[PDB]
């Protein structure tokens, strides 16, 4: 019994030596022995490689006193209607040194707004996770065209994270002390999620008394919508997967049973528009 | 495509502390809410007569101790994700660290609360001659 979450990505024929490798799976076949692990004197651990880490598989049902649940009932999203945002990703695949993850290329919100990451990952080295530039591309077929200008028109991943903080904290200040996130297919944006999102026990914000929705890792510091100019990550968001609601098919085949002013324009903005739109419609409408 | 590095019932505690802003903190606490210390470590086959000090190039564990591979027992290691080190640099992976039997069940949960003596080479608490 295995997991895809942490899969290595690499193309190097071999497992890692004993010192160098994250897990007992991981480590080379020579080592193995006896239902455990052999240090063999005369065989070195590797100083150069470059394994990218697949971040695919994240499983968020734990139960910890003092954190919060990220997934919320539809009675509790409800409740919380003006802090939901749709939220979309499309992906670009890893290639060349590396193969079998995908890595956020474009970030759409039921805002308008789509922002253009530089294909990044987790590739563990010697010494460290180096979190890099990867080499990619846009998966392939006709439907995913639009992708390949994408590829160079992508901004640095620290640079990102701060224009979603700054987003949210305009669309959500006078709205709610909270962001929903409305999903369709969770799987690759709670993925996404990895990039610009921090959790922990619910914190109050430095420069008042409402809920930190905002964490700066320049001061340690927390912030509500109000006062997180300049923060980097979302902290403690809430999201919900409308899929898991007794939809069949697609997402646009169930967006358009409810409704016709959302045109499927084919980019990850639109996919978010039309997921809170499905939601609001099967919700509050009849 | 790609070779699987872990198994499911790690699954949650590796997501829960890959979110957090304090992983070490996030750790402790999955622990005291009774959740399972993180498992598929690289444990080591040795001979148990060895020096006894806590970070080595060989395994060096006593018959007080158990030898594993040093990324296998670092939470930042097996998150993916930044050392708190200010060159972020790690001090266990390429090494083998030593571990008192007796909390061998959770590795990774050790060397998060231990220090090791620079003067002597040994735990504190867990073999330090020191003081
Ligand atoms: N015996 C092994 O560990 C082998 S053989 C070729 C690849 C691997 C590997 C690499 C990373 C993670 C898990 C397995
Ligand atoms: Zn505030
Ligand atoms: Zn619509
Ligand atoms: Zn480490
Ligand atoms: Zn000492």
């Given at each position: 019994n295995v997991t895809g979450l942490f899969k290595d990505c690499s193309k190097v024929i071999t497992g890692l030596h004993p010192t160098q490798a994250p897990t007992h799976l991981s480590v080379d076949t020579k080592f193995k022995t006896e239902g455990l692990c052999?240090?063999?004197?005369?065989?070195?651990?590797?100083?150069?490689?470059?394994?990218?880490?697949?971040?695919?598989?994240?499983?968020?049902?734990?139960?910890?006193?003092?954190?919060?649940?990220?997934?919320?009932?539809?009675?509790?999203?409800?409740?919380?209607?003006?802090?939901?945002?749709?939220?979309?990703?499309?992906?670009?695949?890893?290639?060349?040194?590396?193969?079998?993850?995908?890595?956020?290329?474009?970030?759409?919100?039921?805002?308008?707004?789509?922002?253009?990451?530089?294909?990044?990952?987790?590739?563990?080295?010697?010494?460290?996770?180096?979190?890099?530039?990867?080499?990619?591309?846009?998966?392939?077929?006709?439907?995913?065209?639009?992708?390949?200008?994408?590829?160079?028109?992508?901004?640095?991943?620290?640079?990102?994270?701060?224009?979603?903080?700054?987003?949210?904290?305009?669309?959500?200040?006078?709205?709610?002390?909270?962001?929903?996130?409305?999903?369709?297919?969770?799987?690759?944006?709670?993925?996404?999620?990895?990039?610009?999102?921090?959790?922990?026990?619910?914190?109050?914000?430095?420069?008042?008394?409402?809920?930190?929705?905002?964490?700066?890792?320049?001061?340690?510091?927390?912030?509500?919508?109000?006062?997180?100019?300049?923060?980097?990550?979302?902290?403690?968001?809430?999201?919900?997967?409308?899929?898991?609601?007794?939809?069949?098919?697609?997402?646009?085949?169930?967006?358009?049973?409810?409704?016709?002013?959302?045109?499927?324009?084919?980019?990850?903005?639109?996919?978010?528009?039309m997921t809170r739109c499905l939601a609001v419609h099967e919700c509050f409408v009849k | 495509a790609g070779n699987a590095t872990e198994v499911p019932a790690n699954s949650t505690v590796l997501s829960f502390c890959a979110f957090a802003v304090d992983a070490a903190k996030a750790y402790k606490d999955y622990l005291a809410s009774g959740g399972q210390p993180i498992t598929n470590c690289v444990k080591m086959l040795c001979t148990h007569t060895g020096t006894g000090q806590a970070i080595t190039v060989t395994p060096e564990a006593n018959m007080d101790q158990e030898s594993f591979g040093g990324a296998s027992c670092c939470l930042y290691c097996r998150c993916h994700i930044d050392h708190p080190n200010p060159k972020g640099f790690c001090d266990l992976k390429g090494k083998y660290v030593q571990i008192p039997t007796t909390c061998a069940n959770d590795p990774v949960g050790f060397t998060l609360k231990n220090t090791v003596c620079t003067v002597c080479g040994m735990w504190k608490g867990y073999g330090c001659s020191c003081d």
């Amino acid at each position: 019994n295995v997991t895809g979450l942490f899969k290595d990505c690499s193309k190097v024929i071999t497992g890692l030596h004993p010192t160098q490798a994250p897990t007992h799976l991981s480590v080379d076949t020579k080592f193995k022995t006896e239902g455990l692990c052999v240090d063999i004197p005369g065989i070195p651990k590797d100083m150069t490689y470059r394994r990218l880490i697949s971040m695919m598989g994240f499983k968020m049902n734990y139960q910890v006193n003092g954190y919060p649940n990220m997934f919320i009932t539809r009675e509790e999203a409800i409740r919380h209607v003006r802090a939901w945002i749709g939220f979309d990703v499309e992906g670009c695949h890893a290639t060349r040194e590396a193969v079998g993850t995908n890595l956020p290329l474009q970030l759409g919100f039921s805002t308008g707004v789509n922002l253009v990451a530089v294909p990044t990952g987790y590739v563990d080295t010697p010494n460290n996770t180096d979190f890099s530039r990867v080499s990619a591309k846009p998966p392939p077929g006709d439907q995913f065209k639009h992708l390949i200008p994408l590829m160079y028109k992508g901004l640095p991943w620290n640079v990102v994270r701060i224009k979603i903080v700054q987003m949210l904290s305009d669309t959500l200040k006078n709205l709610s002390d909270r962001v929903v996130f409305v999903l369709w297919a969770h799987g690759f944006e709670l993925t996404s999620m990895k990039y610009f999102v921090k959790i922990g026990p619910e914190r109050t914000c430095c420069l008042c008394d409402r809920r930190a929705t905002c964490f700066s890792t320049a001061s340690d510091t927390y912030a509500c919508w109000h006062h997180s100019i300049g923060f980097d990550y979302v902290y403690n968001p809430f999201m919900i997967d409308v899929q898991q609601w007794g939809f069949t098919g697609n997402l646009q085949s169930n967006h358009d049973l409810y409704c016709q002013v959302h045109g499927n324009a084919h980019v990850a903005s639109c996919d978010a528009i039309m997921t809170r739109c499905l939601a609001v419609h099967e919700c509050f409408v009849k | 495509a790609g070779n699987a590095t872990e198994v499911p019932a790690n699954s949650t505690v590796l997501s829960f502390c890959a979110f957090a802003v304090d992983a070490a903190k996030a750790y402790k606490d999955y622990l005291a809410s009774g959740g399972q210390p993180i498992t598929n470590c690289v444990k080591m086959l040795c001979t148990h007569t060895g020096t006894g000090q806590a970070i080595t190039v060989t395994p060096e564990a006593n018959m007080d101790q158990e030898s594993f591979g040093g990324a296998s027992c670092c939470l930042y290691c097996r998150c993916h994700i930044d050392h708190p080190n200010p060159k972020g640099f790690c001090d266990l992976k390429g090494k083998y660290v030593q571990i008192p039997t007796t909390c061998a069940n959770d590795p990774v949960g050790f060397t998060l609360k231990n220090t090791v003596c620079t003067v002597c080479g040994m735990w504190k608490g867990y073999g330090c001659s020191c003081d």
